[PDB]
Design an enzyme around this catalytic site. Structure first.
Site, PDB file in Angstrom:
ATOM      1  N   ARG A 374       0.802  -1.246   0.000  1.00  0.00           N
ATOM      2  CA  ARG A 374       0.000   0.000   0.000  1.00  0.00           C
ATOM      3  C   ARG A 374       0.825   1.281   0.000  1.00  0.00           C
ATOM      4  O   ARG A 374       0.254   2.365   0.016  1.00  0.00           O
ATOM      5  CB  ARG A 374      -1.007   0.046   1.152  1.00  0.00           C
TER       6      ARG A 374
HETATM    7  N1  LIG Z   1      -7.299   2.297  -8.597  1.00  0.00           N
HETATM    8  C1  LIG Z   1      -6.190   1.662  -8.233  1.00  0.00           C
HETATM    9  N2  LIG Z   1      -5.111   1.712  -9.046  1.00  0.00           N
HETATM   10  C2  LIG Z   1      -3.998   1.070  -8.672  1.00  0.00           C
HETATM   11  N3  LIG Z   1      -3.769   0.353  -7.577  1.00  0.00           N
HETATM   12  C3  LIG Z   1      -4.857   0.317  -6.791  1.00  0.00           C
HETATM   13  C4  LIG Z   1      -6.068   0.929  -7.040  1.00  0.00           C
HETATM   14  N4  LIG Z   1      -6.961   0.677  -6.011  1.00  0.00           N
HETATM   15  C5  LIG Z   1      -6.284  -0.060  -5.172  1.00  0.00           C
HETATM   16  N5  LIG Z   1      -5.007  -0.332  -5.590  1.00  0.00           N
HETATM   17  C6  LIG Z   1      -4.005  -1.096  -4.862  1.00  0.00           C
HETATM   18  O1  LIG Z   1      -4.661  -1.879  -3.888  1.00  0.00           O
HETATM   19  C7  LIG Z   1      -4.275  -1.437  -2.562  1.00  0.00           C
HETATM   20  C8  LIG Z   1      -5.440  -1.550  -1.611  1.00  0.00           C
HETATM   21  O2  LIG Z   1      -6.344  -0.440  -1.829  1.00  0.00           O
HETATM   22  P1  LIG Z   1      -7.123   0.174  -0.576  1.00  0.00           P
HETATM   23  O3  LIG Z   1      -8.030   1.254  -1.049  1.00  0.00           O
HETATM   24  O4  LIG Z   1      -6.145   0.501   0.498  1.00  0.00           O
HETATM   25  O5  LIG Z   1      -7.996  -1.082  -0.106  1.00  0.00           O
HETATM   26  P2  LIG Z   1      -9.152  -1.320   0.984  1.00  0.00           P
HETATM   27  O6  LIG Z   1      -9.467   0.017   1.567  1.00  0.00           O
HETATM   28  O7  LIG Z   1     -10.295  -1.900   0.214  1.00  0.00           O
HETATM   29  O8  LIG Z   1      -8.593  -2.272   1.992  1.00  0.00           O
HETATM   30  C9  LIG Z   1      -3.724  -0.027  -2.789  1.00  0.00           C
HETATM   31  O9  LIG Z   1      -2.856   0.361  -1.734  1.00  0.00           O
HETATM   32  C10 LIG Z   1      -2.999  -0.223  -4.120  1.00  0.00           C
HETATM   33  O10 LIG Z   1      -1.765  -0.884  -3.953  1.00  0.00           O
END
Ligand SMILES: Nc1ncnc2c1ncn2[C@@H]1O[C@H](COP(=O)(O)OP(=O)(O)O)[C@@H](O)[C@H]1O
Ligand SMILES: Nc1ncnc2c1ncn2[C@@H]1O[C@H](COP(=O)(O)OP(=O)(O)OP(=O)(O)O)[C@@H](O)[C@H]1O
Ligand SMILES: Nc1ncnc2c1ncn2[C@@H]1O[C@H](COP(=O)(O)OP(=O)(O)O)[C@@H](O)[C@H]1O
Ligand SMILES: [Mg+2]
Ligand SMILES: [Mg+2]
Ligand SMILES: [Mg+2]
Lengths: 509, 347, 44, 347, 39
Positions: A374
């Site tokens: 992340r």
């Molecule tokens: N639109 C996107 N483009 C590229 N990578 C993404 C995108 N959305 C998520 N990711 C990847 O997935 C990870 C998890 O997203 P996140 O929003 O933190 O997940 P959640 O809140 O659902 O647990 C991000 O840190 C990134 O590495």
């Protein structure tokens, strides 16, 4: 074998005896069962306070019922009995802290178990604490090299990040975290290894491997083996966290490994059921999420203002950090279990290890499709950030393409180009244990793949090509590797320098 | 209490068992711990009786055998076998079988271990054998609710991991003497994810996993190369030749396991020319892992075989290289060394 | 021309493999001497 | 108390988000409730940050951002982001992260909502963002048993539906003023049938579903067009051209879901001439749903793209009608509008 | 003659590689001497 010295050491304890009277709050033991002691009369005992029993045995107050106090023993309980007096110390659980712990093996309370003498630390700190708030933190933008190209290129870890290592039994979870500790001996990052519920011979073998690789002098080892009280196994991660936080709060960087948070959760479930607290989703306590979230939110990066305020101006213009590598074990790949579900939802990323890839000889066994960081590119040096952009998602799409095109007739050039490249990067991501690579070595390997130089190389020769290329650049281009290793910088001069060297290598060796 | 962290021993000396699958993928070490995992009627007692026969060839010290919650007839058979063979004067025997109340089955393991600890602490090298370590934990489950404890997952005692660690940590080699220990582990209803088996894996140096699917094909010992493992399976301990042979066998068996569903629906004829050759070698490797035992002679009639580590590596290396691609698949079944597969193919 | 290149390349691989084989002797003989001297001092 | 039945609003004003998949199958409306459903690591925070960028910044009313059971690092990055973007003077920030006691995590959602209700009752149009509403339910589960309440199915508190209803009914637009709200909903173990996610769907107007299987293929945003839905996807609310394009995309992807398993066992060549063509369009549509976001540049490396409603409709109609059958499958992966896909095919 | 020259260079580079391997092994064996203090 020095006489008089031993006497004066004893005189030093006799000279400082507390000969004055003390006012104390006290109780009496009512029952002794499974590491749990019940007491009557401790009116001023605070929650989580240390209780003093006869013969230097210590306990901790966890249930403050209206008519009774439920305490857990911080060691062997079988020597305690009904009618013994229980006393009250006005102090919360504390452990020794400082650089004096580096190169030592200690128990969950900080006592030395290595037999290498006393730890002359000059500072103690509380085991249970609250992490620094929103306004005191700083964004993660500094790298933590594990030495593995599959991890450092596709799932990067930054100073103050929390990266979960997860998989089934016997597939390299400890090997990945111990190699990451070994790679820090020259990085300037202090290390902490916490062993929870492991057998003592396994702990001794990890310490022997740290010593043989020269990493022990930079590591603190905290042990709570399988025969120790469930209270010590439950507290060990917090004690190790407190020892790591000493460096963070003083403008320094630290790394901590929790070899099994799933064993800490099993120890906490035992205590909670014996205290008669009502069970949850798999007999686990209701607050098993808060057990791990309270631990893992301490691993962080703190701002210059926080360090300047903590040190009363003694340290200035420097940030501090604590990076964590928790480990979790799954049963037959089942992630739906309560504890695995909780921890994956707390960390800044995860590294999934797969038994099918491990049996297939891909030994670092990192599933690139399920694993993710992340923090991403902010945790990488300029050279690795540019040379690794899109590799993770390209491999994820190659695994799908290899399964979809497995039985179909010959496809177009776009399909053959993607498939032939994915097969080469798949063979390149393979690495041996106790063999870390520097920024320059990983960079040459990444450059030769992404710039197309591996297109003429056979899949069965990718390992031999990489090993020979590194050995050649180490003899004929040593000044370029030394320039890349200063900060991991990249520009047209370094790009052309690497290009000229790889071309000369393939055209003459 | 268990021996301290400063009393631990760093031994890596290889122990040859004379059994092909074990010596190839699960190499044992002197002063280490071994566990035999398996469901009902798959081979735990037969494979333990064969190991008792083979390790006593090189070992000259004492042995301690603790019978924890198993058949009384098997204790009588083992006692008379050693008495008639004159082996009895070097073995201490302790029993608390299935006929016994819960208190006996719960403490017999401690009684046998206390005798082994006396011999280790005298500076000797001793063998400690346990008929079934799961019975120590089960006797604890029968009594847990009567002790007023709240139950944990699937009805187990809340103290499951601590009761296991308090016993398991005492079964170790120290700077004074060594304890080599072998234990049979019952797997409830064939489930390796059950809390008792799942909690036991972390206490062992070598893990031998038996399978009912393998036993059903006729292969004995019914060991699973892909689930079984050892701490000694390292290039720095066993050398590169053994390590690469073992890794080569596991790669072939893993790839064959991936094709099982395709082969079941469409048959072998639809596979690629590369997969067809790999499946043929996987079938030969799987059969060459079988071996007739000197304790199993009563079941079939066939004479037992002892295979050295050198002969084991040579046979599997040849099958991986393709040196035996012409011999029929049934020539590898029940033949000890690789040269006997060449003689069996003549019929 | 192709035959001598294949022969030279085969000998080049053998020269490097003999160097790897030699390195292990140099390292393990140092380990046994250093550990033996450590025991010599420990007994004293 | 929640607003009465007589105080409820009735608006259907469409809100553009700039995200292709959302604007196509999940059209939002001003004064409505949106839920971002998904497991761990699929994009809930990232999609909420892109929605805040494309709505909150441009908006001229007040906003409230509530971080409930969030990572303290995300709260710091967002605070510095609102401060550096000069947007902070329009937002009230309330934070209760994972390091805080159960009582805090059980009440932070009510604090943020109380501030939004003061602005709504003044006649203002307000934006309310909640990074994880699942954490309010979990804090109730963690404390429920210590409050003396017997557990219900899957270990949740017996008051699961009422505790959720008492909170969700206050998050609403009334005749006085409006609240537009976006909530992120965690799905335990990716199972949409779990009591907590299952009880949440009925409280929302727009339901956006994020899939782990799409994220595992490098496709982002990882939104599932078949499981996602909105109350605004009606020809009488938007138009027949938009609706037909959305149902057209869904039809093609639904048919492809049964063919995926066919191709994997019997191969692509055994499908009909119409099926082979449809599968190619489905794989292209599946890639054209992807788009690089400005808040995801640190993960993707490439720059961020904003796409409009008309551009989104035109691009998907072109792939459905066959105007791009000659372009390669990889040309639609991560490219904003339809023009850039025609350009990527040349590289 | 070009084949003679290339074959000479192929063996020359091999002898240069062999020399590097033995020198690194001498430095490893020299560093392994940490045992004079460790244990
Ligand atoms: N639109 C996107 N483009 C590229 N990578 C993404 C995108 N959305 C998520 N990711 C990847 O997935 C990870 C998890 O997203 P996140 O929003 O933190 O997940 P959640 O809140 O659902 O647990 C991000 O840190 C990134 O590495
Ligand atoms: N990169 C590698 N290359 C080759 N073998 C490896 C590699 N990494 C790990 N292994 C080997 O595979 C095994 C992994 O054991 P390890 O203890 O690290 O796994 P684990 O998941 O932590 O096991 P456990 O559940 O017992 O703790 C060891 O035999 C180790 O030597
Ligand atoms: N090596 C073997 N060769 C032939 N049959 C075997 C072998 N091992 C086990 N069996 C068969 O399986 C039966 C059960 O074996 P046993 O060791 O008693 O199982 P367990 O102890 O695991 O319950 C034996 O009586 C025999 O019929
Ligand atoms: Mg491990
Ligand atoms: Mg039997
Ligand atoms: Mg999130």
């Amino acid at each position: 074998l020095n006489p008089s010295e031993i006497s004066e050491i004893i005189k030093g304890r006799i000279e400082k005896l507390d000969v004055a009277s003390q006012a104390r709050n006290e109780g009496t033991i009512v029952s002794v069962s499974d590491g749990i002691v019940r007491i009557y009369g401790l009116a001023d005992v605070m929650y989580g306070e240390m209780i003093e029993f006869p013969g230097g045995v210590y306990g901790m107050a966890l249930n403050l019922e209206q008519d009774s106090v439920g305490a857990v023993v911080l060691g062997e309980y079988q020597g305690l009995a009904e009618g013994m007096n229980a006393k009250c110390t006005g102090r919360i659980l504390e452990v020794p802290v400082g650089p004096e712990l580096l190169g030592r093996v200690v128990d969950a309370l900080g006592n030395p178990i290595d037999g290498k003498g006393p730890i002359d630390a000059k500072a103690t700190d509380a085991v249970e604490k609250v992490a620094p708030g929103v306004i005191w933190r700083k964004s993660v933008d500094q790298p933590v090299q594990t030495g593995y190209k599959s991890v450092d290129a596709m799932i990067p870890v930054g100073r103050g990040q929390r990266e979960l290592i997860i998989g089934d039994r016997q597939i390299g979870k400890t090997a990945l975290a111990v190699d990451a500790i070994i790679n820090q001996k020259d990085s300037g990052i202090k290390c902490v290894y916490v062993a929870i519920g492991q057998k003592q011979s396994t702990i001794a073998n990890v310490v022997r491997k740290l010593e043989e690789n020269g990493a022990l002098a930079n590591t603190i080892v905290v042990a709570a083996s399988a025969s120790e009280s469930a209270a010590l196994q439950y507290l060990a991660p917090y004690s190790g966290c407190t020892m790591g936080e000493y460096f963070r709060d003083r403008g320094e960087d630290a790394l901590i490994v929790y070899d099994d948070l799933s064993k800490q959760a099993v120890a906490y479930r035992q205590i909670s059921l014996l205290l008669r607290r009502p069970p949850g989703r798999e007999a686990y306590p209701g607050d098993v999420f808060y057990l791990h979230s309270r631990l893992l939110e301490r691993a962080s990066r703190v701002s210059e203002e926080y360090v300047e305020k903590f040190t009363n101006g003694a340290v200035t213009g420097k940030t501090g950090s604590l990076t964590a590598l928790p480990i979790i074990e799954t049963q037959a790949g089942d992630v739906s279990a309560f504890v695995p579900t909780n921890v994956i939802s707390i960390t800044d990323g995860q590294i999934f290890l797969e038994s099918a890839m491990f049996n297939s000889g891909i030994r670092p066994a990192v599933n690139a499709g399920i694993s993710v960081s992340r923090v991403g590119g902010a945790a990488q040096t300029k050279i690795i950030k540019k040379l690794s952009g899109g590799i993770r998602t390209a491999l994820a799409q190659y695994r799908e393409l290899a399964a979809f095109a497995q039985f179909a007739s010959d496809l177009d050039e776009a399909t053959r180009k993607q498939l032939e490249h994915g097969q080469r990067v798949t063979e390149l991501m393979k690495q041996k244990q106790y063999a870390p690579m520097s920024i320059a070595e990983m960079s040459l390997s990444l450059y030769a793949a992404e710039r197309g130089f591996l297109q003429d190389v056979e899949i069965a020769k990718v390992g031999s090509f990489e090993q020979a290329l590194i050995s050649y650049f180490q003899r004929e281009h040593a000044a370029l590797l030394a320039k890349i290793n200063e900060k991991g910088d990249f520009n047209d001069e370094i790009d052309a320098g690497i290009k000229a060297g790889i071309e000369k290598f393939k055209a003459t060796q | 209490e268990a021996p301290s962290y400063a009393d631990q021993a760093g031994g890596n000396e290889l122990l040859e068992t004379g059994i092909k699958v074990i010596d190839l993928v699960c190499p044992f070490a002197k002063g280490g711990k071994v566990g035999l995992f398996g469901g009902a009627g798959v081979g735990k007692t037969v494979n333990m009786m064969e190991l008792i026969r083979n390790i006593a060839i090189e070992h000259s010290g004492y042995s301690v055998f603790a019978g924890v919650g198993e058949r009384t007839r098997e204790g009588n058979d083992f006692y008379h076998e050693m008495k008639d063979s004159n082996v009895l004067d070097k073995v201490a025997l302790v029993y608390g079988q299935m006929n016994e109340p819960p208190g006996n089955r719960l403490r017999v393991a401690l009684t046998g271990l206390t005798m082994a600890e006396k011999f280790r602490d005298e500076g000797r090298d001793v063998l400690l054998f346990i008929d079934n370590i799961y019975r120590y934990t089960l006797a604890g489950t029968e009594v847990s609710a009567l002790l007023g404890r709240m139950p944990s997952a699937v009805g187990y005692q809340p103290t499951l991991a601590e009761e296991m660690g308090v016993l398991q940590e005492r079964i170790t080699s120290t700077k004074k003497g060594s304890i080599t220990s072998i234990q049979a582990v019952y797997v409830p209803a064939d489930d390796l994810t059950d809390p008792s088996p799942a909690t036991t894996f972390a206490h062992l140096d070598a893990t031998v996993v038996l399978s009912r699917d393998i036993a059903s094909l006729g292969i004995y010992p019914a060991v699973d190369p892909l689930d079984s493992t050892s701490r000694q399976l390292d290039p720095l301990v066993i050398g590169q030749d053994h390590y690469d042979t073992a890794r080569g066998v596991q790669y072939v068996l893993q790839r064959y396991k991936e094709l099982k569903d395709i082969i079941a629906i469409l048959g072998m004829d639809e596979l690629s020319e590369a997969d067809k050759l790999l499946v043929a070698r996987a079938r030969k490797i799987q059969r060459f892992l079988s071996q007739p035992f000197f304790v199993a002679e009563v079941f079939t009639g066939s004479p037992g075989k002892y295979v050295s580590l050198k002969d084991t590596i040579a046979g599997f290396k040849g099958i991986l290289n393709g040196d035996y691609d012409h011999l029929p698949e049934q020539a590898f079944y029940m033949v000890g060394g690789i040269e006997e597969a060449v003689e069996k193919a003549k019929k | 021309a192709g035959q001598q290149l294949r022969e030279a390349k085969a000998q080049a691989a053998e020269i490097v493999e003999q160097a790897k084989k030699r390195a292990n002797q140099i390292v393990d003989e140092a380990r046994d001497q250093a550990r033996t001297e450590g025991e010599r001092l420990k007994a004293q």
